Subunit: 116 residues, 4 copies
């Protein structure tokens, strides 16, 4: 589990459940290639996106579909999505947790990077 | 103006208006003595709490009545309040802005400290 | 595990390890009674503070000694501590996760409250 | 002035000065077209990006070059940048302030949207 994504709802103090997440990797030609996708579980987490061996050095983008999450709750939020873009594994393999905290007009994101 | 508080509402995407703010200094016997108060303006700001000459070195507490704010909006809050506590002026007088971001189950606070 | 506390360092993207945490409960006379204490583990977490049966309804305060954490890293931070104050269990038993995100001049806190 | 960006540095407790900011509109073919740019002032603010008449309804992207900011300070950053993407003006013209808080491994962003 070198990459996991966790999403929380700051209005309810809860996991944000069933949030779509798409991950991309920047190719050598500079385009963004689809890399993995999934949706958050009942705990707000999304595990199993990749493997140590597939998750090579590169620039990755995690796109969180926050707008659909809010719209299903009846809210028209500010952001179209939350996108988190980062270089991974540039000094060897690491485990990444991308946390995102949602409010209708704000989001926060934090990365926790550990060396297993 | 040595101490400013600024509050934003992450649910509405607005300044947090009419939020009550109380300021305390720590007394000799470790108790919190009341020092200033006010409420945020239509821009979410509260100015005028103290003056340069009264705002001497010491430990100060700012307590933001978030619970009453959310209750006035009809939104269920988690916290009783949001407090910063900080030592002021320890390397000379400074201007302090306490920037606060509010959600019902989360807040943030940040000091912006500038030299006069 | 009705109460857990998790602390992260936003400078390094890591758990904040060995952070002291003191929990208080407001007594019927309005004073703050010591309730539990501990320090964060290697994962930034502090588990085992209380039990379902001891953690009755009340107003609780979680005091995080963030200043000592920064000072051990050579930094003189803004805040003396981070304090999180909240009513717990007012509509029956819940599980509370109090997360805190530390920077030298900022902290963030989020509560995740689940019904087991 | 319909679009303002304001950036704070949670490590220094200061405005984030000289941060490069690029603004894009989404074109008919889904591509991002460059729209404005600038850098934050000594107060961490960037004003003057557009005018009321040019800032028509559409989807806009603001991309904040956080990586270069942290590199200029000698501090190792996680993200390549911080971006908001939002639909503007969907219920009439608004003034938008994008408030951004930066740490090396975390950021936040919040929209403060006021009616003219």
């Amino acid at each position: 589990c070198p990459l996991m994504v966790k999403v929380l709802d700051a209005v309810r103090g809860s996991p944000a459940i069933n949030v779509a997440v798409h991950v991309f990797r920047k190719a050598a030609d500079d385009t963004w290639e689809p890399f993995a996708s999934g949706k958050t579980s009942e705990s707000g987490e999304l595990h199993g996106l990749t493997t140590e061996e597939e998750f090579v050095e590169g620039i990755y983008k995690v796109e969180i579909d926050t707008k659909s999450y809010w719209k299903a709750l009846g809210i028209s939020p500010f952001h179209e999505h939350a996108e988190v873009v980062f270089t991974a594994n540039d000094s060897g393999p690491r485990r990444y947790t991308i946390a995102v905290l949602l409010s209708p007009y704000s989001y926060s994101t934090t990365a926790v990077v550990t060396n297993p």
